[PDB]
RNA sequence: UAUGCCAGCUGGUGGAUUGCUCGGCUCAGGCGCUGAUGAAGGACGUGCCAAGCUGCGAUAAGCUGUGGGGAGCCGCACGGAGGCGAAGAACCACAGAUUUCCGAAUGAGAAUCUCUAACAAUUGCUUCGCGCAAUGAGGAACCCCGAGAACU
RNA sequence: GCGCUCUAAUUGGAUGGAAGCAGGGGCGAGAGCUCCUGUGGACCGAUUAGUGACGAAAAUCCUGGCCAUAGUAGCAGCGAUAGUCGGGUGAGAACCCCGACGGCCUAAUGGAUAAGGGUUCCUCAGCACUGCUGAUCAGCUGAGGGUUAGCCGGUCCUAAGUCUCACCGCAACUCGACUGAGACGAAAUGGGAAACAGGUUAAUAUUCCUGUGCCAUCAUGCAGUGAAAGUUGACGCCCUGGGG
RNA sequence: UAGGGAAACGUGAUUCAACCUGGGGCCCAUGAAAAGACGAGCAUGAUGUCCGUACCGAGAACCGACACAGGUGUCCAUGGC
């Protein structure tokens, strides 16, 4: 499927948004944060549009 | 911080031209390096950088340019 | 997880336990039942020899259609659980470790008492997946005592 | 105001661009033409632009691979920025 | 050929998308409307009285 | 005496219970319109490191002025490196600057992008020239004018 | 008449250890009241008058947790029966890699792609999670990197048809047929200006590099002032010859 | 005296996909349109921007809750016996 600029700018977005609660906020929130409540895998899960 | 507001405003329209265009070029010159791994930063300062840039750029609209 | 629920005299005995391992909770009942009485050492080759398959454990409570065994004395179903086996081997090979850095006499300790408890739920991590089936999890406490 | 150059786009295949065809890639803003990317360029930077290609980037960005005249040398030019 | 299973395979014509009026993925690009704000049918945005209960 | 029955003890599993409350629910007084000066809403950005939330908008967790406030500070968020503040910062109040794209969406088209100057459209006045204006859309419910069921 | 929540008045208890919980003692026909020990570590009553989302064994009741079932079924059945011996790496190897031997797929199990997916691609580090067993492997986990075009596509044109504006209808509209104008409507697979060869990376390639070539537009100069008639785009089904 | 190959770096033939060009037959069926091209020369120079481009394309990258025995379009229809 071909895509558009803008469509490529949102996947480029989302694929961005899937990435591990940097290892430091751990520690500066004692913990109380670690997980990324939005992990969307490829095969796993469907990506709006 | 190393840059002040009435200093800005001591300047003439051509002056602020001046050294805005300067902190740009110096900012983005902090870019590259950061984006080159850069680590001889002092991450206080690439945040100035903005800063005053935004304090020039208010002013240019204040006095008129 | 568990805590050592007989209570044990630092000056005459060792201690050992396993956490949250993924293995056959039913095998480890037998396992311990088994070695319990035995010697640290007699324990090792004991199990060694089930990883082997000339020595099978007993299965006197989970038997549901398991076959007879003719080496069982005084029953008659066992098998040869090698994966739960070679987790006792592992918790031996530390309780007779702190055994010997205290000055005993490890190989030749009393198991006094080995008990295996279903603990459940690994629980998910932070960047991790999440478990498939409900796969057991088993704790195991150890009391090594001199002769 | 939007600038046309955000900053070099510096990768093991940048580095060969720029040691090997004398090629300096940028990540650029993605409004930016070859031509408007090729002036901010020259002049940024004082050289001449013989060539620029363009892509836009799974990463929101557009990414600009620009080729120098045979004048200019690209490693000459990176080193000091 | 079941209605079932064997149908659900040739389901790969795209029809709702991500909405460049309310953000939502209801743009119907073959419609070229929105069924959620209306976006394309109307300039008002889509919303009825029965979208919660009477007296609420 | 195996397999085993009943009750207890020690440990576990489980998360009830008791205690606690940063959230709710309800009542009450006050107050009450926004938008072409492009709103409400959305997309996408923006941080030294930044995924979410909040904020902000290419001047991007912010810029300016006045007043308050005060030795501390760099949101939630307690890390690491660094920085800012007696040139009075942080923080609060009012006022102003900036304020991307889609969006009534208005030059034209388009799943938030694109193509070569624009109040598109409908109107009022008219220098009969878009020159000066109006309308459009939003809002918790309340309000006013029309259309108007069925279960029961 | 017993018990629960909170309000009030009157009156008490508690870090010298409240509530709750576990085990145990006494009272009451009983609803229940009370005490002892352990735990717990901060709240808790009594009497009177009130208050009410006030009492459960049940509803194929609701939600959560758990046991037996059971170390049982499945991990065999498909015209694709697939491995074996050595060796490599490794804490660990039946299934990760190398060699040999033996096989499987032939319109597909090969090659190129549309839709669709959306980073699944390459690299490095991982194995708690995922993989019908295992795993040192991986589409898994994490971090990095990666997609380069005048001549491939879109873009332009029009198809069935669609929308917009005007007009008209309707109580009215985000509704509705006609007419008029405008726009939209084809990425494998409609029409269509123009690219080939070789080389190159971990990952791109008619895009990058080397070589050669072609198309359009415009500017300049020369020619020509012919210029729009026409041809083409541009076409069904069946049989067949010739060139190649 | 491009390129490519370790080397040779062939020549003729038959049958001939692609492609090219014809003749015949059928219709109570008549088998798009428009943009564009040609018509209408040459030389030198300049410009040629914008979007897509990774990978899967399937008994694990798509739809079917799944690494699902199902479903899912095109071209390779000329490799040998
Ligand atoms: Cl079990
Ligand atoms: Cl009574
Ligand atoms: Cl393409
Ligand atoms: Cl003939
Ligand atoms: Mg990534
Ligand atoms: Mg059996
Ligand atoms: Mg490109
Ligand atoms: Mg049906
Ligand atoms: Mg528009
Ligand atoms: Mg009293
Ligand atoms: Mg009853
Ligand atoms: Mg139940
Ligand atoms: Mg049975
Ligand atoms: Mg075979
Ligand atoms: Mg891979
Ligand atoms: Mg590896
Ligand atoms: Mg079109
Ligand atoms: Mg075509
Ligand atoms: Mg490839
Ligand atoms: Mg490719
Ligand atoms: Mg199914
Ligand atoms: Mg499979
Ligand atoms: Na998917
Ligand atoms: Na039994
Ligand atoms: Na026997
Ligand atoms: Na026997
Ligand atoms: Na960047
Ligand atoms: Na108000
Ligand atoms: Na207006
Ligand atoms: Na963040
Ligand atoms: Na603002
Ligand atoms: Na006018
Ligand atoms: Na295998």
């Not at chain 3, 039942?33 to 020595?55: F, H, N, P």
């Not at chain 3, 179903?77 to 090698?82: K, N, T, V």
């Not at chain 4, 150059?5 to 580095?15: C, G, S």
Request: proline letters at 3%.
């Amino acid at each position: 499927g071909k895509k558009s600029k803008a469509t490529k700018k949102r996947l480029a977005k989302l694929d961005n948004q899937n990435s591990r609660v940097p290892a430091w906020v751990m520690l500066k929130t004692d913990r109380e944060v670690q997980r990324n409540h939005k992990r969307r895998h490829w095969r796993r899960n469907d990506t709006d549009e | 911080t190393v840059l002040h507001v009435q200093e800005i405003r001591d300047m003439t329209p051509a002056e602020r031209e001046a050294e805005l265009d300067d902190l740009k070029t110096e900012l983005l010159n902090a870019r590259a390096v950061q984006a080159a791994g850069g680590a001889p930063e002092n991450p206080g300062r690439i945040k100035e950088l903005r800063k005053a840039i935004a304090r020039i750029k208010t002013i240019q609209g204040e006095e008129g340019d | 997880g568990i805590s050592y629920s007989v209570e044990a005299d630092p000056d005459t005995t060792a201690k050992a336990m396993l956490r949250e391992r993924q293995m056959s909770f039913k095998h480890s009942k037998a396992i311990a039942r088994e070695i319990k009485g035995k010697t640290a050492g007699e324990a090792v080759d004991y199990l060694e020899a089930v990883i082997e398959g000339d020595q099978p454990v007993p299965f006197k409570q989970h038997n549901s259609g398991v076959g007879h065994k003719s080496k069982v004395d005084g029953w008659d179903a066992g098998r040869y659980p090698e994966k739960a086996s070679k987790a006792f081997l592992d918790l031996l090979e530390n309780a007779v470790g702190n055994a010997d850095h205290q000055g005993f006499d490890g190989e030749a300790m009393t198991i006094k008492h080995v008990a295996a408890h279903k603990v459940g739920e690994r629980k998910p991590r932070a960047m991790g997946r999440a478990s498939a089936w409900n796969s057991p999890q088993v704790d195991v406490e150890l009391i090594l005592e001199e002769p | 105001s939007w600038d046309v150059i955000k900053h070099p786009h510096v990768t093991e295949k940048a580095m060969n661009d720029m040691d090997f065809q004398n090629k300096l890639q940028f990540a650029v803003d993605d409004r930016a033409s070859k031509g408007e990317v090729a002036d901010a360029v020259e002049e940024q930077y004082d050289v001449t632009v013989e060539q620029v290609n363009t892509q836009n980037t799974m990463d929101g960005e557009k990414k600009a691979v620009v080729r120098l005249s045979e004048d200019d040398d690209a490693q000459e030019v990176a080193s000091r920025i | 050929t079941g209605a079932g299973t064997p149908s659900q395979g040739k389901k790969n014509t795209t029809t709702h998308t991500k909405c460049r009026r309310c953000g939502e993925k209801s743009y119907h690009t073959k419609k070229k409307v929105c069924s959620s704000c209306g976006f394309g049918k109307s300039a008002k945005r889509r919303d009825y009285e029965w979208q919660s209960k009477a007296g609420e």
